[PDB]
Structure formats: C-alpha cells, structure tokens
C-alpha cells in the first residue's frame, strides 16, 4: 500500500526549514510498503496481548481532558483554542460533546487531518547537505481531545506493562544510563548495536495500526472508550485525507499520522513487536532492548566476530520483511560508548570521590546552535532549558549552556519566572531556581561534582565551539565564576544554584550534600499537559 497518496496542491506554509524544502520530503516519505509476517511476528504478539489482558484502563471525563491540553496547542476550525478548552468555556465543551458522540455515533467516514511543514532549526554545515523539513499531520484541537478522552490512560499505563524494562520513557537520564550500563555489564562478552528505520511513520501499515488496537483491546475498556478505540482506529489512525494550511485536499495517508495520541505509544509497541520478533530470526543469544519509540538498541552475547555480521544481516532481512528497512545498515558494537541511540552517547568522568561514573552525550552542535536561535527570535519553547535538564552532566551543558543562560536571567531578573519546556511528549512549566533540585533527581548528586571528561568528548565540545565561532571554555569558565558569585550574594534559592550549579568554576570547591528541597523530589508537580 502507498504511504502517502498526493494530489498536487502544494504543502503551503502557516538555518531552518521552510514549506519549500517539502517537496523533498514527500518523495522520500512516498512508498509501497510489503509486509511479509512469520511465526516469530505471531508469537511475540501473543506474548505482547498476554500482557495488556492485565491493564485496566478509565474514560477520562470532557472536562479531565481539557485540562490535559497544552496551552500552545493549535486553535480549532470550529473557533475555539487551547486557552478556551483549559479555561473550560461552554464553546469548546459542547464542540467536545458533538465530536465525542460522533466517535461513538459514525464508524466509517474518515476524520480530516491537515498537513504541515515542521520548521525546525539544524545547523549550516557545509558531510551532506541540508535536512527537508519533517512532515506534520494533525487532526482538529475537538478530535484531540477525545484521543485523551477513550486513549490517554492507555498510552501512559499500557507500554510499561507490555515492555516492562524495554520501555524507554519510563526513565530518567540517569535511570537510562543505569540500564544500558547493567545490561552492558550483565553479559559476559557484550555485542550491541542500534538499528534505524528509514521514515518509520511511512513504514507502519495498516495491518500494523489494526495490530496496535488489538493490543489496546486486550485492558478492561468502558463500552463507550472500547468503541471510540475502534472508530478512531478506523476513522483517523488508519491514514485519511491530507488537508494543507489554505483548505486544499493534499492527499491521502495511509501509514501513521505524528500529530495523534497513539503516535508515540503506538511506534514503541510497533518497533518492540518487529525489533523482538526479529530478535528470534537473527538467533541473537542473551538479548536486550531499549525502545523509545522508532529508537532501538539492542544489547546481547557476542558469538564471534564473522558470526555477528552475520546475524545482524539476518536482523535487518527479519525487519526489512516486517517493513522497516534500515537507513543506513547496523554495525555490530563492542564498546557501548560508540552505541548511539535518542541521538545520545554513554561517557565515563570522575566524581569527587574519584569513582567512575556513566552519563548519556550527545554533539553539541544542534543545542547551542538551537539555543543561539531561540536568543535571537524570541519562541514559547525553550530547547535549552530541556537541554540543560536532559544534558545536565555534559561538559557543553554545564559550561556553556547553564553560564549562559543563568547570566542572562540575572540580568533581566527573570529566575523565579517559570518557563515552558517541552522534553520528548511532556510539557513542563519549570522555574530556573528549582533547577538543582531537578538535576539532583534525575541525574544525581554526581552531576555537579563531574571532572576528569574522555579527552574526546573534551575536543568534541572544544572543535564545536570553534566551529560555530562560540568563545572557547576559558571565557566560560570566567564568565561563570561572576555568575556564581552574584548567585550567592542574592541568597536563598539563587545562592543553591550557585553552589551546586556552579561549583566547577571555582579552584576551592564546596562540600556538595544532598540538597533539602530534593529530599522530597516529587517531581510532574511540574507537570503542565503531555504526555
Ligand atoms: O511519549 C511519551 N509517552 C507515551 C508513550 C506513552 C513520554 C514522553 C516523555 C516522558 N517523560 C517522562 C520520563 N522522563 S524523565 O527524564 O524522567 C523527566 C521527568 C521530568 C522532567 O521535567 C522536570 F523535571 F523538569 F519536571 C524531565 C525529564 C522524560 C523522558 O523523555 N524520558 C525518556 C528518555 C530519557 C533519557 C533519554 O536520554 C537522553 F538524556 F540522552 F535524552 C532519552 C529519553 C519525560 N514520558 N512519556
Ligand atoms: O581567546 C580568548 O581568550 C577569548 C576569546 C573570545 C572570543 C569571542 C567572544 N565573543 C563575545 O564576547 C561575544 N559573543 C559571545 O560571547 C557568544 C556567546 C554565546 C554564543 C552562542 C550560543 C552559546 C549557547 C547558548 C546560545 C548562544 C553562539 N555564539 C555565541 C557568542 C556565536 C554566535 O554568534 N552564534 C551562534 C550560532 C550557533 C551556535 C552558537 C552561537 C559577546 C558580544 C561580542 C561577541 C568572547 C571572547
């Protein structure tokens, strides 16, 4: 079946990427998927199906949905937006109601979807050439709310149930590391790699949406959840008509649509059941996986050097069967520094007490050069402060990002201001001040007691900063000490932010102790919409 199906009105819009680059992307999106399913495939859903029978699930009310709405989400046609929805107006609610018992009235007629050029910010470097803007396809704000309504305690209790330690979302950067670290450890003669899907949204079938909403079908569903499964499954998730931004019809979907609940939840089940059945076909001894979303790695005993190349092809014939062909083909790994996977690396430095420890990496390229931007053109995202949170142990984001930022926010007197951010699916409302507290949580006190960097990642940071013509690591570490300074004359929360934040700047560091905010981390008490 073809992925997409055009009709030659053009994706109109509302370095970066604009509408014109679109064009590009359609041809590399546009397909014919053939899906050939084995006894493995059979099996490994069974086993799948087994695990969801556990899940018991509850309808969300028109007005528990509400209030999960990102505030920045796009307005409705049917003249109502994100404000209006959360502040519960009787416009929105009744608009909600219709949609909603339309789900459960209609079975058949295709819900409309509008088409879209993701405008997003990567770097002018003159290896290969410019990235065409992503693709975004999106049903009405009225239609996403009731995905939340029959689907939004599915999606954030059903993976972790049927993947258990497979499922990637369910940790923090730190737990992450932790992961990959022991399973690295765990094996006796440890062989990884990650395999990427080429257009994964392109790659996901019919077939596999069905599978997808028979795999939700196995929780205890309230009848009206249970039928607007099936009516949304049929109605929107199965592909439908492509509408752009002036009213024209685009084309037509048939494969996965990235503006819907399901999306992420749904390519973590799909990936999971391609990647574990493989797993089988490929004889891969002792295996372990860590799925988020379309990103797989994949962890196991080695059984020789020619015998992993082997297997590894068998891999990628198994998955390339199951339509999802690789990018660029999967290279056995014996070291899982070199293992790449959520654009991240696993690196080793030295805490205070001189023990070794493992943070997750990536290049620093696209978050500063992301951060330079949101300087500039003023954005209700901030790429940095989620950097900051997720990149916390990093060289680059303690140095350059954390100086930056926090010098900035003095000046404008903006630290006890809250600011949205969004990390993966999740939308935070987070105050700079708090940030420690939030470090300490999801990384550990170790993270700002790191020193002793992999001469690499030093020069990595070092030839980047070059390159962007970003002043070297002496002005940062300059530039921090007076930040750190003006941090503990303002006392309170500001002077923890200088102590622990900051404590690398100074020749005479402090003894760094658990902080007493982080004591009772509560943590999605910053929690504004997601998931
Ligand atoms: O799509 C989703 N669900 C659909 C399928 C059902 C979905 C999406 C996100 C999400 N979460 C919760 C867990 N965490 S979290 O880290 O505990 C955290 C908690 C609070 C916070 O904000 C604060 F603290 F400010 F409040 C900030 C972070 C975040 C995360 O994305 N984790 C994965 C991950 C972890 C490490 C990685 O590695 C590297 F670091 F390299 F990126 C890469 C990915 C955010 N949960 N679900
Ligand atoms: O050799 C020595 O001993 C010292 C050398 C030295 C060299 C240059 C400076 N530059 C500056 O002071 C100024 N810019 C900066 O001090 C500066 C700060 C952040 C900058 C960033 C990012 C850093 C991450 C957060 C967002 C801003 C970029 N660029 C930056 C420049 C360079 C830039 O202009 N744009 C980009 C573009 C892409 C990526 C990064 C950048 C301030 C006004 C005059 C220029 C300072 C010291």
């Given at each position: 079946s073809m992925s997409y199906t055009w009709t030659g009105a053009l994706i109109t819009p509302c370095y970066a990427t604009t509408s014109r680059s679109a064009s590009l992307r359609q041809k590399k999106v546009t397909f014919d998927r053939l899906q050939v399913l084995d006894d493995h495939y059979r099996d490994v859903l069974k086993e799948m199906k087994a695990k969801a029978s556990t899940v018991k699930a509850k309808l969300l009310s028109v007005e528990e949905a509400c209030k999960l709405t990102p505030p920045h989400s796009a307005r409705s046609k049917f003249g109502y937006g994100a404000k209006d929805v959360r502040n519960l107006s009787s416009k929105a609610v009744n608009h909600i109601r219709s949609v909603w018992k339309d789900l459960l009235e209609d079975t058949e007629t295709p819900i409309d979807t509008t088409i879209m050029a993701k405008n997003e910010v990567f770097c002018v470097q003159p290896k290969g050439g410019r990235k065409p803007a992503r693709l975004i396809v999106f049903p009405d704000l009225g239609v996403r709310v009731c995905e939340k309504m029959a689907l939004y305690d599915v999606v954030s209790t059903l993976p972790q149930a049927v993947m258990g330690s497979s499922?990637?979302?369910?940790?923090?950067p730190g737990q992450r590391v932790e992961f990959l670290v022991n399973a690295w450890k765990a094996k006796k003669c440890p062989m990884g790699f990650a395999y990427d899907t080429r257009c994964f949204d392109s790659t996901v079938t019919e077939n596999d949406i069905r599978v997808e909403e028979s795999i939700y079908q196995c929780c205890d569903l309230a009848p009206e959840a249970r039928q607007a499964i099936r009516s949304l499954t049929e109605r929107l998730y199965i592909g439908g008509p492509l509408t752009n931004s002036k009213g024209q019809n685009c084309g037509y979907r048939r494969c996965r649509a990235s503006?819907?609940?399901?999306?992420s939840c749904g390519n973590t089940l799909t990936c999971y059941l391609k990647a574990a059945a493989a797993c089988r076909a490929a004889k891969l001894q002792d295996c372990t996986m860590l799925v988020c979303g379309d990103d797989l790695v994949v962890i196991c005993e080695s059984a020789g050097t020619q015998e992993d190349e082997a297997s590894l092809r068998a891999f990628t014939e198994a998955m390339t069967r199951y339509s999802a062909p690789p990018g660029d083909p999967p290279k056995p790994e014996?070291?899982?520094?070199l293992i790449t996977s959520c654009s991240s690396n696993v690196s080793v430095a030295h805490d205070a007490s001189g023990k070794r420890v493992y943070y997750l990496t990536r290049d620093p390229t696209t978050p500063l050069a992301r951060a330079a931007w949101e300087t500039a053109r003023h954005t209700p995202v901030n790429s940095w402060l989620g950097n900051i949170i997720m990149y916390a142990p990093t060289l680059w984001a303690r140095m350059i990002l954390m100086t930056h930022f926090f010098s900035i926010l003095l000046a404008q007197e903006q630290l006890e201001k809250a600011l949205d951010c969004q990390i993966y699916g999740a939308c935070y409302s987070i105050e700079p001040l708090d940030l420690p507290q939030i470090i300490q949580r999801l990384h550990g006190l170790s993270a700002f007691s790191?020193?002793?960097?992999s001469p690499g990642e030093i020069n990595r940071v070092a030839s980047c900063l070059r390159k962007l013509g970003v002043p070297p690591l002496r002005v940062w570490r300059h530039r921090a000490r007076s930040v750190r300074a003006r941090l503990l004359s303002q006392g309170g929360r500001a002077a923890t932010c200088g102590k622990?934040?900051?404590?690398?700047?100074?020749?005479?560091k402090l003894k760094l102790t658990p902080i007493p905010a982080a004591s009772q981390l509560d943590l999605s008490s910053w929690f504004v919409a997601g998931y």
């Open positions: 499922y990637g979302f369910q940790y923090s503006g819907v609940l399901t999306t014996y070291d899982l520094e790191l020193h002793s960097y622990y934040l900051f404590n690398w700047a100074v020749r005479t």
